[PDB]
Amino acid sequence: TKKKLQDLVREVDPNEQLDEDVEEMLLQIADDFIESVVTAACQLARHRKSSTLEVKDVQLHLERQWNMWIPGFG
Amino acid sequence: PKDAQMMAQILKDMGITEYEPRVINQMLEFAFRYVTTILDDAKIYSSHAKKATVDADDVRLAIQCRADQSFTSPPPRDFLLDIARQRNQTPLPLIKPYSGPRLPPDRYCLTAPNYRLKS
Amino acid sequence: QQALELALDRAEYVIESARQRPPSVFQKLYDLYIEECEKEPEVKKLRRNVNLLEKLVMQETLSCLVVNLYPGNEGYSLMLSETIRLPYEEGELLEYLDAEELPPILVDLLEKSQVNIFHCGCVIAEIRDYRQGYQSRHILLRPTMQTLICDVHSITSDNHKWTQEDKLLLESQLILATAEPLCLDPSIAVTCTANRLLYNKQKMNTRPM
Amino acid sequence: PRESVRLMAESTGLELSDEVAALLAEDVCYRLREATQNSSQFMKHTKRRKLTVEDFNRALRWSSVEAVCGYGSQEALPMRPYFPEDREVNLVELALATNIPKGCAETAVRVHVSYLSVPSAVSSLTDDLLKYYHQVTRAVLGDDPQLMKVALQDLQTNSKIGALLPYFVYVVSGVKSVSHDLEQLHRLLQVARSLFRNPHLCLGPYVRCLVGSVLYCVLE
Amino acid sequence: CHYSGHHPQPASFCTFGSRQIGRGYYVFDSRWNRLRCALNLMVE
Amino acid sequence: SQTNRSSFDLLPREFSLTIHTIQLIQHNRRLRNLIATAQAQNIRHSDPESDFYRGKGEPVTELSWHSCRQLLYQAVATILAHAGFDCANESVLETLTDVAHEYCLKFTKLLRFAVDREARLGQTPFPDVMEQVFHEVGIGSVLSLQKFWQHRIKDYHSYMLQISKQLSEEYERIV
Amino acid sequence: LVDFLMQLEDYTPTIPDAVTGYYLNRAGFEASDPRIIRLISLAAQKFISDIANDALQHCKMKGTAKYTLTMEDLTPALSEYGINVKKPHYF
Amino acid sequence: KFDHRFQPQNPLSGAQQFVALCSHTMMLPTRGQLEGRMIVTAYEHGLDNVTEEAVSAVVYAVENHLKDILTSVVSRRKAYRLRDGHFKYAFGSNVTPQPYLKNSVVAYNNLDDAEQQAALLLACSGDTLPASLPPVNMYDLFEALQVHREVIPTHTVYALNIERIITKLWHPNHEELQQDKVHRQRLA
Amino acid sequence: KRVRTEQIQMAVSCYLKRRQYVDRLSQTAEEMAANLTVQSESGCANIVSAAPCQAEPQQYEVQFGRLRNFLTDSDSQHSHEVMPLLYPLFVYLHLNLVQNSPKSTVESFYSRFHGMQKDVIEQLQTTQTIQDILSNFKLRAFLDNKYVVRLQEDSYNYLIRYLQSDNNTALCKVLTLHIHLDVQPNEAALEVLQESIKRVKPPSLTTICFYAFYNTEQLLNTAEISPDSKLLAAGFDNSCIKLWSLRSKKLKSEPHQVDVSRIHLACDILEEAGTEMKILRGHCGPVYSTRFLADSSGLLSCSEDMSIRYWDLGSFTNTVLYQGHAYPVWDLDISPYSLYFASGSHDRTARLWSFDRTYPLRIYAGHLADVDCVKFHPNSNYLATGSTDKTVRLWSAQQGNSVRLFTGHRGPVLSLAFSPNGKYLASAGEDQRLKLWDLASGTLYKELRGHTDNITSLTFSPDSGLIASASMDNSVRVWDIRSSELVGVYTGQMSNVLSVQFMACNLLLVTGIT
């Protein structure tokens, strides 16, 4: 469809190849990253007042352990 | 010096009877650094909690985050079993006696000279 | 190396001796089949095939589990009547049926509702191939140590203040109850026999195919 | 206990409730107890039983915990009841005052064999050798046939080394004195050859006392 | 910093991703969602 | 019935600018105090004929843990005094030495994983192994060391000397 | 003008070769030629001098609103590199 | 004596209840595919009012995280140059000169007309035939995580994946090498 | 409340009744090999679940047509063992055409390639429905039987290469189902008395030899003596491995032209003594084990840097690296006759290795703590892994299954050893007790209490009648198997005892530190 795995490789290094067995591992890395973020976000969601919302503002406070900052609104 | 005696007792409870006088002070520094960091983590959670006083649930979340990333432990009793299960179908190579302990093929060994440097 | 050929010659003697002539459901029935289907017409047509259908299905008509495979954009199915619809392209049961291994999901269903089929841990699953009319496929699902390790886990979940030592003692009794005979021969000829008889089953592929 | 947590909490800036420090102190004890257990694995396995500073640092490194830096190895930091460290020393005289690069670290291995002269083993006083010595010296050698195979096989199995007397006597008395006679030396070589085929006899340090008599057999 | 017979439980461990299904079987947070629904709303 | 000695064994037969800069600092303190008391009382190219150009060299004498730490304490003390300091605590020195010890261990350990990794492949991303390890550590290149040395040793010494010369003229003018 | 070879001669190391060489022995290196073991000492000097210069800047802006090094000049200088040191001053 | 030693707490006892993939599809999760996973995992925690900005932030976080993994892997196999500190931009050819050449020293000190400058970078150092590296196997990524250890700070994610990486290690043995030799001696 | 043993026993019996275990530990390998044949093919299923369940109207002839084009051209040496294989493949595929029963596809396949005895071919021509196959009474047995081929491993390796190519899954279905392959790589009473008396040995067969280490820094991990008594290897804390000579040979090193411990910067040119000391510097952290190959041809030694680096005795430098557990490694040991090796790490598991691959082959999981001790059975078939969870397991080198579990220790286990006859097992640890376990019954029969400190290593005598237990309290006690069963207590004049080993002639080697 669009941006499966190869165009992201071109986004960094124009001439780089990945083995067939490496692609699935990276997706599982992303799959584990997705679950870890949402579980922690839901934990903070239940911490605001026992539950409020999935909030983009508290996600910024969550990314301090990942040492990353989204260029979003905030 | 009340901390010195209990720390020696803790080491004694683990079957250690000979130590150095500097490790006891190191663990006291480690304990001081551990609580000071987790109190700061409580402060930022309390400041993000838009509350004046510090609640006790923020400490529970703060210590939860500390154990999540700052401590290492292998996955016990369930993940390693799957590894043996997914590798149980791997067969065993045949034994061909020629001279005994053969070696992995050429290239996949630590015997290779640098390409750039030459004679 | 001179010891290795002596072991190899001894291993060759052992394997031919156990192959040419032989030396209450699991062990007794297979021994009867060996005694029945051993003689040969001296033709280069050996009868050591799978033939699991004739062992129990056509001679005892016992209970079995039927697995449906529907080819093409539809997936597979499982029955107990009361079919299920699950798509393919999932590494959840294709790998568990890829060898003689007992998937955990069945064990959960076999302990609460049904009491029908128990064969010393091993179960028989029938695979249907409508489009290669269905074909018969009877294979043995040999349980692994994950079942017995999780067996105590249900037993541990009893709210009776189970200790570590009591569980470990229960670990040993369960393992010893379903234990396998061990060869105590210090000779190294066992390795050649063991490797040959375990490579003839898994000579297909590890990485390439 | 719980009073120590409150003191350093005050230095942090804010006080803590009495129902919170109890759990916090319990958490500290669990971490320190686990740290000592991790340091024990590196400790009781190389070859030692003495606690060192580096062992605790290694446990923190492999547990994704920051290593404590600032404590050396020598015994220091006294307590006089209070942690003063106001030792204002100048670095001018500490630059080049007394230095020596001599290490003097060498390794040497030597081999010595202990006994457990005549360690109450040369003399036959065990009440189990004199009778057997008589049988083998006057009934296994010489005239009587049809006895060599059974006796030699029994002697081949058992080692019973450590007397060191009898085997030398047969060689000395059978070669240096029966050199001009037959029907004895042939069987003396046969029993000697079977001794070399016994894999439980230590004939290493006894090559000079046997080969010299062997060269006597081939001489003349 | 206390001494007692009972083991001090932190109750704030690393919480490795694992859910309890069947009280004996454990899942790594995924790949057992649709199948569990299929064999629980049908078998029982 | 005796014999000879029976024990066979084999016995081996075996049983400048940093100091000078500090001296200039001492001279300025020798001049600063006098002024303070007086104010209130008014072609080279590498020749390939040597053993240094190759890897030939004399092995370094092996030391122990006790002797290595003392040299670390001495080395750290001298370089801090060169920075412009005159007194410091003991634990502060101990913290700096441990950080330097850990930094050296991590740098040396990182080099080892770099050396043995290329020994099995034969191809190098960077032309030098030493060039590579600086990149993961933070040093841009070895060619940046000359600029650091020039701007922190030679320039500092030339600047430090001028202050001494300027204060010497002040002493000659006042007295 | 001049290549790096004799420029390497011009440097005056402070850490002796018996300290850097021992580090290579710990990691599994011979440390038997003079030429490789001078950059590690220089790299170690650069790492400490940057912290030393940073501490000097903090010390000279302490209370101006002889030179003694304390924890107030060390815990902020080590903060940028990621070193977090916190030592209790009593008990 | 032995009773004073503690026992480690089992993390397996504390689990969550379960009342009621994007792995085999070879796809990055899109906006529509992630929506189903968020709503099903928020019902267990009891969340309402599903928004849209949070989904986008998660997608971009995954995109940045995967870029960091590939940047770390390539950096261990190819060369790069640093501009004003920590910025990696080249990820390309051999424009970096050899520091043991005096011509490189004066060139370093210095820093139609455009083509000659490219020659000063692309032709002042290297070999006559620069051979490229094999594609990234299961070994290169395994060693990349060992050295850096900074890409994934969470132990719950880094640990469970690294043993799966170990199980995927493979290299041809002696027996397969003759088959390559036999095939190579057949086409010639 | 408190769980008693009797209710545990009935729980085991209840589970046996649940799974129908109402219904043998022998030593003969004839029936075990006969059994191994039975369950090595009893319902084999490898690609059965991944069968090519596609329509594919036009796959058989195009695939089989490729077989004749590649297997009959430019190949004569490897063709004689595979030319007969093309004969039954046409017949088996013809039956597969009978099973799905097409109208013209089966006729086209038979008519176009009729050239690849004659009675079998003509029977297939005259039959086109499955009912005739069942009524022929000869083709029905043909389908219910397999055609065995006795080919070499190279021919199978030639076949295994072709089957991986594109459009070969349908052909692989016949191989996994229809064809089974084989791969071939005066009373005389005085003599009676001495037979009954001399057999029973206070043997006084110590013959103790000591190797001493002189005044050095207080660091030393292990020291192993070569079985042929030619070399002495030791591991230091600062990644130092030194090799000594025990026969005064003054061995010389050979050129290798490739070194690992040397940087070899770009300013070098590739240009092409003494003994009794040679440092082997290949590791980063401490070295925890050092083992030989029983032939003085190599050296295996795991370290703390999550790597196993094989040492060569021909080039005398690091040659082979094993990036395995990625976790610190505790113990390492070698299989007899130099076949395989294994080690344990911090991940509660031990992994089987090989001499041809740089990655582990088998995974042994089930422990609750780090594995500190592991050994090989003398027949190289069984492994025993010890840990600090007061459990001793017994694994298999072939299938990777734990058959036995031994419990009863009060603490960790620090020593394991297999008896030379391979029927007894020993275990000792921090409990200051020496334990003997039977490999058949699985129950303890001796309670040996002689040491008051930790037990380091265990070594059985060649006659399987004596054992020496080295401890940390400066006491080397040799006990009799065949605290009142001790031969001789050695008094410790040194700091500690490192290793004890029996090779032959009841020679005692005790290694210590002065």
Numbering used by the authors:
A (entry chain R): 59 to 132
B (entry chain M): 13 to 131
C (entry chain D): 2 to 24, 35 to 91, 99 to 150, 158 to 234
D (entry chain K): 13 to 93, 100 to 134, 145 to 248
E (entry chain L): 509 to 552
F (entry chain I): 15 to 29, 61 to 87, 129 to 261
G (entry chain O): 116 to 180, 192 to 217
H (entry chain G): 108 to 127, 138 to 228, 251 to 327
Task: Cite, word for word, the article reporting this structure.
Evolutionarily conserved with yeast SAGA (Spt–Ada–Gcn5 acetyltransferase) complex, human SAGA (abbreviated as hSAGA) complex is a well-established transcription coactivator that regulates the transcription of numerous genes. Several distinct functional modules have been characterized for the 1.4-MDa SAGA complex, including a histone acetyltransferase (HAT) module and a histone deubiquitinase (DUB) module that establish histone modification signatures for transcription activation, the largest subunit TRRAP that directly interacts with transcription activators, the core module that serves as a structural scaffold, and the spliceosome U2 snRNP factors SF3B3 and SF3B51,2. Here we report the cryo-EM structure of endogenous hSAGA coactivator complex purified from HEK293 cells at an overall resolution of 3.7 Å. Human SAGA coactivator forms a rhomboid architecture, with the core module serving as a central hub for the assembly of TRRAP, SF3B3/5 and the DUB module into the complex.
The core module contains nine highly interconnected protein components, among which the histone-fold domains of TAF6L, TAF9, TAF10, TAF12, SUPT3H, SUPT7L, and TADA1 are assembled into an asymmetric histone octamer-like fold. The remainder of the core module, including TAF5L, SUPT20H and the HEAT repeat domain of TAF6L, exhibits an extended and curved organization and intimately contacts the octamer-like region. In the vicinity of the interface between SUPT20H and the octamer-like region, residues 509–552 of ATXN7 from the DUB module meanders through the core module and extends toward an extra EM density that is visible in low-resolution maps of hSAGA. Over the same surface of human TAF6L, an unassigned EM density was found at the similar position where yeast Ada3 is located, suggesting that the unassigned chain might be TADA3 from the HAT module of hSAGA. TRRAP is primarily tethered by discrete fragments of SUPT20H. Helix α11 of SUPT20H passes through a groove of the FAT domain of TRRAP, and then a C-terminal αβ structure of SUPT20H is snugly nested at the joint region of the three TRRAP domains, strengthening the SUPT20H–TRRAP association. Compared with the organization of Tra1 and Spt3 in yeast SAGA complex, human TRRAP is located away from the TBP-binding pocket of SUPT3H and no longer hinders the path of the TBP-bound DNA.
